[PDB]
Design a protein around this ligand. Structure first.
Ligand SMILES: NC(=O)c1ccc[n+]([C@@H]2O[C@H](COP(=O)([O-])OP(=O)(O)OC[C@H]3O[C@@H](n4cnc5c(N)ncnc54)[C@H](O)[C@@H]3O)[C@@H](O)[C@H]2O)c1
Ligand SMILES: NC(=O)c1ccc[n+]([C@@H]2O[C@H](COP(=O)([O-])OP(=O)(O)OC[C@H]3O[C@@H](n4cnc5c(N)ncnc54)[C@H](O)[C@@H]3O)[C@@H](O)[C@H]2O)c1
Lengths: 141, 665, 636
């Protein structure tokens, strides 16, 4: 007799300047893509005396079942920005991504919004000075 | 604000009703939802559009004949007597010359027309000469076939009529095309023999609601006489919306409720002046409109009974699926595969949330009626047996179990033979016996057993053993003929005997019997109750069988492969676990309900393609690669271990060729 | 028998007078439209050996007097003898004989099945046996039975089985049926509802009178009621007469002026004096086989069964070939490559003979001008729809797609210029709204769709009105799903949430679009639109043109690649040439992505154990796909 076991995670997306909770949703998928690019970046000998390791790192995140904070919605509705994300998945890890960028696209469904497409995508934005992509914290099991 | 206050004011009026004007609302809303609601718009609904009342015409004729206008109101007979004198004295070319001036005017349609064409009436019987109702139907995307003359009855372009029992001015503003001066009321049955029959048939086969028509009218009196000629109870009681200024005397109400009418009074529902007719109409019409959306639902017993009103029919079925349950609630709650429930958007009170909260606390379940308690004791069992756990927000670590309690799914052919050889007790036993027989070959006996099942359910009102028994027979028919045409070109001498288990006479019997069946029409041929009380059991008899499951299965497979190549991680439910849950749902449903359609190419392909994806994902998960920080991201999951059900499914609907190639690839 | 009967029916069809041919043509059309109602009487039941009425009158007569009558009973003695028995002997004795005679079980003759083979909307019988009810139940055609006054209101289904002469369902008593004289003398006072319910079906349906004599009480009463009507005012009923001797001409003229259109059974065939089962069968099989097009053999006739199904599909600019096997019946499957194959015809092949008229010049020249100008339109339309000649005569097989939609190529300036110029020819307005949908001005598109819906109901064009309503519903969905996200993800995606729609406009659309379901739109259109444009039904439902995705399942596990690409281009051409807003929603994008991804994956797979793309493939990839999907296909 099969029994499927499924866990869940809570994703907390907020602003940088204050503790204003932008919204809270679930976790659907995460993609850490570290690799290199075409030969156009580095061709012939060039910097042979000092070989430099190039590491292209991308952090994509998807969240589903997202509801926006009422206070933040009221503040923003009545009349660039850098945000952050926090993870509290289960032990239980506390992953925090700072300076993320929310991408997105609008889709229209025939059945008046079948599944309502509540998928929000985030991309990890890295600056020349800032370096901490994710803070991993472990707690009691 | 008008809308800000009116919504709550209607609720205040509703909770203040006498409950005698609540059964009328219940019946009217039920008729509107069942497509058997017909309105009888009178001559008082057009007056809201400032249409010329008939008394201003008799006054115009009376001015022509007897000098100055009359000093006083006109009785119920002078209306038909003054124009008749004008016609028989002044002439006929002058009779229409006044109708043209008093009726060749275009007026706007009042909101009561929208209120009437908001409940989707089956037909609209009216006694007006204007084109306001037709115009309202025109500018709202509803096509009503108009009938204003005897020659229009046969040429009905559509099925929903707009019968005018008084006439019309479409052919021209002449008095010969309308019901008018007293002679027209005498030579009516002789002049309109077809329209009267159509009106008296729509009245006798629908739920009629009267709007306008102050009591004491000529037409209401004639209808009351005809209903008096009826036998005892064959006719229903027409409702009657009374919207006069003063309240109704109790003696008059008692007098008119013993003749057939069920008067819904408007003056006894709100406070209004002598010339507040629009508000009096709109109060009743708005109560009727807002009662069908479940806006007036407060009590807990209402919620439990309403939920029982969509689950009680589904008791003959042994295990209904979860994606199909969304149709049972008119697209209000997305029942998910894991058992969690969500809100589509809504229409009224959140009855599902209230039901879940009632099930959470024993005290609240004890704070309700007794009969509703008995209903709850069955709803809880049905929901637990069908894998519904909680609301979406209150989810958690769900140990979703699956169970296929059927001898067909577990082999055990000797037990099937033992059951088959035994006698039968009830028709549900014959159904399972026929399914077991079909699983054991012997299709000649299975077809006859299904025919006997269909014949032995004549007046039992159990469509599940009737709708399915035919369908299974169709699937026990094709599999016969498809088997017959395959043993001639492939099984010609494969066994050295040319074994054709079905003879030549039986195949000619089934052709005669299973001719012009048109299975796609069968659901539309069932009674009106079965077409809505069992609307889920319709995807069996169409090309939709496993259709949209495959439509979503492609998306799931593509997502699984993408996440397989992106080196991405999954949280909660994935694109692979959902496939397993949906496949097990369909597999349990088909076998537990004993549907022969679980032995066709479509299902054998769907299960194959689902389990191939599951095996792909499991084998990929067995060899995952460590990442920079993803090494501490995907941990304990291990959600795919091939169990007994997977093994039995991986060797029955499964092909030797793919296992030959998928074992090494 | 097997060959003799089939040849005899087709031979008798060629000798029938024009009157019988016209009667059969009208009956078949009424049955196909769904407005055919049979009127079964005593004679379709006596074929099942059910006792005749005179055998009970004789029992009453010999229980009253003592000997059977010396002759045949008249019309008065049929109602007076049982009435004398009821008055004198009593009521329980009157019911004992009824129980003795009518408590029998009899089979159902084939005629009872043939009557159900024509799909009658209703069935009106004047006998008390349950043979027709049993046949309807066994064949799977549910009919609500109405044998009592209380049954009229409690009608579960929409199709009736009105038994206007009582029934023995409640018991074998004389109080449930009409047998005596006073029962007929009080029929309009004791049965006021079943009289209206019978007189309404007669006036609003096609009526046939199988199983009746030409001098019955019921027929004369019906004719007396009919003579009280106006000039024509209704369709004259048909009357299948199956008596032994041929009908005299004087009595035929007398009855054909009272309303009946008699189709005598003992004039099309010659049969024995007692072979009644072979006289019902002649007419019934003639009608049924006339439905199946077996009796169709001529050059001008194939230009009527071909023009009469293609002419309605002229407002549309390009219809798919996948569903072109639906405008014609399921026979003659149409393939994407352009090959035709008959599957379930069971009659004279018309398309196969149709191709011959386009493969010569003298055979075509032998057609009448009215039938020749029709053939020219049929031929040019067929070429324009890529339906080139029969499978057997296969030749140079080429496939080209020439989507001329001004929005597929993304010529936005041309769309703006077309919108600016004032438009007439309301179809041209129907394009503009779609262009207004492409540019994003959804409010103007909604307004222009409402204007088209207003000025289209008056016209006789239902296709434009139906498509405009569907497009307006889709635009309303798009507006609602955009407003629900601007007050939402829009703050994060853009910030300073745009309000491109006025709140009053949203309230107006919510007041108009509400209380309107999309599943019943096609069911509200007229009967002609529900039959001429049935192929347009899939647009109404949310599972629109989903007849292709399942083969994606089947073609994933002329090859599959070419057929899949051809269907993709067919759907694109259909949804873009005919301006439909449902081409920009997630379902169609998902279908396009799935098809193109499958084609690319199969090309890579076949490259191991290649494919050449073009402008239409590049546009589809760049439009219906996303960056993530393209990255996935490049890396996989
Ligand atoms: N009866 C006469 O001879 C006569 C003479 C002069 C004036 N009138 C006026 O005619 C009006 C109605 O009397 P009636 O005899 O024609 O029929 P009625 O009052 O007996 O019944 C007509 C029904 O239509 C509705 N109705 C009446 N006036 C309406 C209005 N302005 N707006 C919307 N609905 C309205 C009401 O629901 C009414 O029950 C009266 O207000 C009266 O002032 C009548
Ligand atoms: N009228 C009498 O008193 C009487 C006396 C002795 C015998 N009969 C016989 O009873 C039979 C019916 O007489 P009727 O007065 O009702 O004429 P009728 O024409 O009014 O009978 C009604 C219809 O029954 C149909 N039918 C189908 N099978 C039939 C069958 N085997 N026999 C008769 N009709 C069949 C016929 O189309 C007939 O038109 C006749 O065969 C007659 O010889 C009648």
């Amino acid at each position: 007799m099969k029994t499927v076991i499924q866990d869940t995670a809570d994703v907390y997306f907020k602003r940088k300047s204050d503790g204003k909770l932008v919204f809270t949703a679930e976790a659907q998928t995460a993609s850490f893509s570290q690799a290199i690019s075409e030969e156009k970046l580095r061709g012939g000998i060039g910097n042979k005396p000092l070989y430099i390791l190039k590491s292209e790192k991308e952090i994509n995140l998807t969240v589903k079942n997202a509801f926006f904070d009422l206070e933040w919605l009221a503040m923003t509705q009545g009349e660039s920005e850098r945000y952050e994300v926090e993870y509290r998945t289960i032990s239980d890890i506390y992953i925090q991504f700072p300076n993320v960028s929310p991408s997105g696209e609008f889709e229209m469904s025939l059945e008046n919004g079948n599944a309502l497409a509540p998928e929000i995508k985030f991309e990890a934005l890295a600056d020349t000075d800032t370096d901490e992509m994710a803070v991993v914290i472990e707690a009691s099991r | 604000l008008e809308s800000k206050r009116y919504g709550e004011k209607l609720k205040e009026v509703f909770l203040m009703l006498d409950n005698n004007v609540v059964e009328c609302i219940k019946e009217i809303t039920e008729s509107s939802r069942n497509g058997k609601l017909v309105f009888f718009v009178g001559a008082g609904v057009s007056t809201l559009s400032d249409y010329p009342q008939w008394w201003r015409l008799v006054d115009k004729y009376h001015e022509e004949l007897y000098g100055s206008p009359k000093k006083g109101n006109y009785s119920s007979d002078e209306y038909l007597r003054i124009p008749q004198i004008f016609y028989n004295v002044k002439g006929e070319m002058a009779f229409d010359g006044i109708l043209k001036d008093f009726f060749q005017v275009d007026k706007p349609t009042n909101p009561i027309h929208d209120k009437i064409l908001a409940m989707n009436p089956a037909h609209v019987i009216t006694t007006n000469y204007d084109n306001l109702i037709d115009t309202a139907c025109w500018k709202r995307g509803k096509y009503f076939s108009v009938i204003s003359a005897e020659e229009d009855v046969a040429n009905a372009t559509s099925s929903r009529y707009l019968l005018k029992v008084a006439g019309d001015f479409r052919k021209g503003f002449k008095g010969e095309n309308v019901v008018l001066k007293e002679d027209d009321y005498l030579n009516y049955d002789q002049n309109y023999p077809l329209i009267s029959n159509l009106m008296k048939t729509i009245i006798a086969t629908h739920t009629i609601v009267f709007i306008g028509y102050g009591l004491g009218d000529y037409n209401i009196n004639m209808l009351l006489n005809w209903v008096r000629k009826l036998q005892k109870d064959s006719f229903h009681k027409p409702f009657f919306i009374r919207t006069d200024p003063s309240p109704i005397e109790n003696e008059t109400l008692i007098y008119y409720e013993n003749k057939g009418l069920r008067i819904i009074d408007a003056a006894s529902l709100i406070d209004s002046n002598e010339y507040d007719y629009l508000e009096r109409y709109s109060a009743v019409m708005d109560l009727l409109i807002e009662s069908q959306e479940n806006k007036f639902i407060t009590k807990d017993d209402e919620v439990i009974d309403y939920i029982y009103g969509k689950i009680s029919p589904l008791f003959a079925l042994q295990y209904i699926r979860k994606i199909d349950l969304k149709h049972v609630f008119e697209y209000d709650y997305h029942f998910e595969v894991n058992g969690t429930v969500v809100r589509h958007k809504n229409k009224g009170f959140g009855y599902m949330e209230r039901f879940f909260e009632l099930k959470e606390s024993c005290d609240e379940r004890s704070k309700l009626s007794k009969k509703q308690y008995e209903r709850f004791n069955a709803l809880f069992n049905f929901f637990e047996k069908n894998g519904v756990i909680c609301m979406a927000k209150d989810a958690g670590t769900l140990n979703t179990s699956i169970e296929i309690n059927s001898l067909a799914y577990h082999g055990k052919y000797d037990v099937m033979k033992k059951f088959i050889e035994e006698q039968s007790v009830s028709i549900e036993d014959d159904y399972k016996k026929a399914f077991f027989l079909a699983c054991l070959g012997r299709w000649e006996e299975s077809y006859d057993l299904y025919s006997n099942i269909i014949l032995n359910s004549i007046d039992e009102s159990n469509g599940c053993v009737y709708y399915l028994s035919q369908i299974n027979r169709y699937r026990i028919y094709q599999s016969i003929t498809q088997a017959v045409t395959q043993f001639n070109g492939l099984g010609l001498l494969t066994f050295g005997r040319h074994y054709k288990p079905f003879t030549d006479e039986f195949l000619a019997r089934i052709e005669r019997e299973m001719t012009n069946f048109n299975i796609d029409d069968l659901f539309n041929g069932m009674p009106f109750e079965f077409q809505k009380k069992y609307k889920i059991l319709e995807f069996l008899s169409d090309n939709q069988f496993l259709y949209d499951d495959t439509v979503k299965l492609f998306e799931l497979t593509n997502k699984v492969r993408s996440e397989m190549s992106e080196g991405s991680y999954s949280f909660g439910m994935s694109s692979d676990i959902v496939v397993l849950l949906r496949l097990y749902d369909n597999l349990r449903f088909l076998y537990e309900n004993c549907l022969w359609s679980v032995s066709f190419h479509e299902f054998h392909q769907y299960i194959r393609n689902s389990m191939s994806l599951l095996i792909e994902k499991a084998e990929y998960e067995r060899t995952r690669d460590i990442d920079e920080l993803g090494f501490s991201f995907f941990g304990k999951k291990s959600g795919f271990f091939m169990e007994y059900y997977d093994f039995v499914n991986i060797s029955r609907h499964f092909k030797i060729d793919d296992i030959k190639n998928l074992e090494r690839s």
